[PDB]
Design an enzyme around this catalytic site. Structure first.
Site, PDB file in Angstrom:
ATOM      1  CG  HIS A   1      -1.648   1.179   0.917  1.00 27.62           C
ATOM      2  ND1 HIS A   1      -2.803   1.021   1.766  1.00 27.62           N
ATOM      3  CD2 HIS A   1      -2.200   2.152   0.236  1.00 27.62           C
ATOM      4  CE1 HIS A   1      -3.708   2.062   1.140  1.00 27.62           C
ATOM      5  NE2 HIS A   1      -2.925   2.555   0.819  1.00 27.62           N
TER       6      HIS A   1
ATOM      7  CG  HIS B   1      -0.884   6.913  -2.025  1.00 30.12           C
ATOM      8  ND1 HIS B   1      -1.754   6.617  -2.932  1.00 30.12           N
ATOM      9  CD2 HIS B   1      -1.594   5.814  -1.042  1.00 30.12           C
ATOM     10  CE1 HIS B   1      -3.540   5.544  -2.829  1.00 30.12           C
ATOM     11  NE2 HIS B   1      -2.708   5.510  -1.260  1.00 30.12           N
ATOM     12  CG  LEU B   2       5.374   4.615  -5.541  1.00 29.06           C
ATOM     13  CD1 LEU B   2       6.381   3.682  -6.328  1.00 29.06           C
ATOM     14  CD2 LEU B   2       6.239   5.123  -3.715  1.00 29.06           C
ATOM     15  NE  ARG B   3       0.618  11.344  -3.237  1.00 31.56           N
ATOM     16  CZ  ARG B   3      -0.447  11.254  -2.508  1.00 31.56           C
ATOM     17  NH1 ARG B   3      -1.467   9.989  -3.429  1.00 31.56           N
ATOM     18  NH2 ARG B   3      -0.659  11.104  -1.479  1.00 31.56           N
TER      19      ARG B   3
ATOM     20  CG  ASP C   1      -6.086   3.796  -2.651  1.00 38.55           C
ATOM     21  OD1 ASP C   1      -6.731   5.323  -2.063  1.00 38.55           O
ATOM     22  OD2 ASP C   1      -5.240   3.646  -2.305  1.00 38.55           O
TER      23      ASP C   1
ATOM     24  CG  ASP D   1      -2.871   4.846   2.855  1.00 36.60           C
ATOM     25  OD1 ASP D   1      -2.481   4.832   1.879  1.00 36.60           O
ATOM     26  OD2 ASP D   1      -3.819   5.319   3.440  1.00 36.60           O
TER      27      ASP D   1
ATOM     28  CG  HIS E   1      -0.919  14.546   1.502  1.00 35.40           C
ATOM     29  ND1 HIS E   1      -1.657  14.344   0.230  1.00 35.40           N
ATOM     30  CD2 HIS E   1      -0.677  13.802   2.029  1.00 35.40           C
ATOM     31  CE1 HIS E   1      -2.714  13.779   0.127  1.00 35.40           C
ATOM     32  NE2 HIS E   1      -2.302  13.207   0.704  1.00 35.40           N
TER      33      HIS E   1
ATOM     34  N   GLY F   1      -3.265  12.110   5.811  1.00 34.09           N
ATOM     35  CA  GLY F   1      -2.247  10.206   5.281  1.00 34.09           C
ATOM     36  C   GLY F   1      -1.083  11.095   5.564  1.00 34.09           C
TER      37      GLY F   1
HETATM   38 ZN   LIG Z   1      -4.038   4.634  -0.250  1.00 30.97          ZN
END
Ligand SMILES: [Zn+2]
Length: 375
Positions: free
Chosen positions: A61, A63-65, A153, A265, A269, A276
């Protein structure tokens, strides 16, 4: 120099129920032998005295954006975070821009990953084209290109028939559907419990595997528990960084084995998942806190970073079985350090553990027999 010995470490492989002072011989990217006292010519030796030697961690899980928001994070920066936190494999979510709903984006991620060369990035597909909610994506082409699971997601599948069609397809292909993450009637206080129960009921009816990516309540955990006993293929995760109706129940959940795996996760940001936090680089010391407080054993802790996540996305990782690839993490459970500008490898800083003293640090990470991180 095709050959590596990790000497003098304390090996733990929960998958093989293996614990003790052993050495590890690595030949040709692969675990060749585990035994006390190994010595061979033409081998690099790592002294792991005082260290713990285990399978490379797997985060299902992250987030690599990338593509899209690469100023927050990208495949390279996340890869670096990952290996510095002990992770040899990570699974990236598909709320990129463009979203991962076609094989061109799958391919971009795999090619970038191969070039950075640090950890193995496994992509996920969207459940719906666009992540829009209406039209179900092409799970067959996406799995073929390399997707290991599907998820919307960042806008969970409201339409209950969309979810039902997704789990039928998933069951044919042999891959999990991940449900219920928020990121970039209406909002009842028990929306979560009702959603988990829906996913359970559809999971049993379809044969499909559903993975709950966020549980917050005791009732949620009891519902997940109820369906596991009934033989239904439902799993869930918890962010070790977040444990610092109840937060207290989650700890009970980890104790009792309801919660299958740790997952960060990781959610970069750039102002400060509510909304998150980054996680990859601090996952281990966070999770060791539970171990120091007697809530889980070390074996269980390592289970939840290795073999258990591996079984959810169905890859043959998270072990040190002879023949498996030599993804090895070597860590000192008692080394103190601080996440700050000096140590942070993320492009973002968004974590409440910024500046705090952490206890437990990865000393080496090895992917396919090569050293991809060193303190
Ligand atoms: Zn997520």
């Amino acid at each position: 120099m095709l050959k590596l010995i990790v000497k003098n470490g304390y090996v733990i492989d929960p998958s093989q129920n293996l614990e003790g002072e052993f050495d590890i011989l690595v030949e040709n990217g692969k675990i060749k032998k585990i035994d006390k006292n190994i010595l061979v010519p033409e081998a690099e030796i790592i002294d792991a005295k005082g260290l713990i030697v285990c399978p490379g961690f797997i985060d299902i899980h992250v987030h690599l954006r990338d593509p899209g928001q690469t100023y927050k994070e990208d495949i390279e920066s996340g890869s670096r975070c990952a290996v510095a936190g002990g992770f040899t494999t990570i699974v990236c979510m598909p709320n990129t821009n463009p979203p991962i709903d076609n094989t061109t984006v799958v391919n971009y991620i795999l090619q970038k990953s191969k070039s950075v060369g640090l950890c193995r990035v496994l992509p996920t597909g969207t459940i719906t084209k666009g992540r829009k909610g209406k039209e179900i994506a092409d799970f067959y082409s996406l799995k073929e290109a390399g997707c290991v699971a599907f998820t919307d997601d960042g806008s969970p599948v409201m339409d209950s028939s969309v979810m039902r069609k997704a789990l039928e397809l998933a069951s044919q292909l042999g891959v999990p559907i991940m449900d219920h993450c928020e990121d970039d009637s209406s909002r009842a206080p028990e929306a979560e419990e009702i959603q988990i129960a829906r996913d359970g009921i559809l999971a049993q009816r379809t044969g499909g595997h559903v993975h709950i990516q966020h549980v917050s309540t005791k009732l949620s955990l009891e519902i997940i528990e109820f369906f596991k006993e009934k033989g239904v293929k439902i799993t869930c995760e918890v962010n070790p960084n977040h444990l610092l109706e109840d937060r207290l129940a989650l700890i009970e959940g980890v104790k009792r084995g309801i919660i299958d795996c740790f997952a960060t996760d990781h959610a970069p940001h750039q102002t400060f998942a509510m909304p998150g936090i980054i996680g990859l680089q601090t996952a281990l010391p966070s999770a060791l806190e539970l171990y120091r407080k007697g809530i889980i054993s070390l074996k269980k802790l390592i289970e939840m970073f290795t073999i258990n996540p591996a079984r959810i996305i169905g890859v043959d990782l998270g072990t040190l079985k002879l023949g498996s690839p030599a993804d090895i993490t070597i860590f000192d459970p008692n080394k103190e350090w601080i996440l700050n500008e000096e140590t942070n490898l993320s492009k973002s800083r968004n974590t409440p553990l910024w500046g705090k003293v952490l206890k437990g640090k990865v000393i080496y990470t090895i992917k396919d027999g090569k050293m991809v991180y060193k303190d």
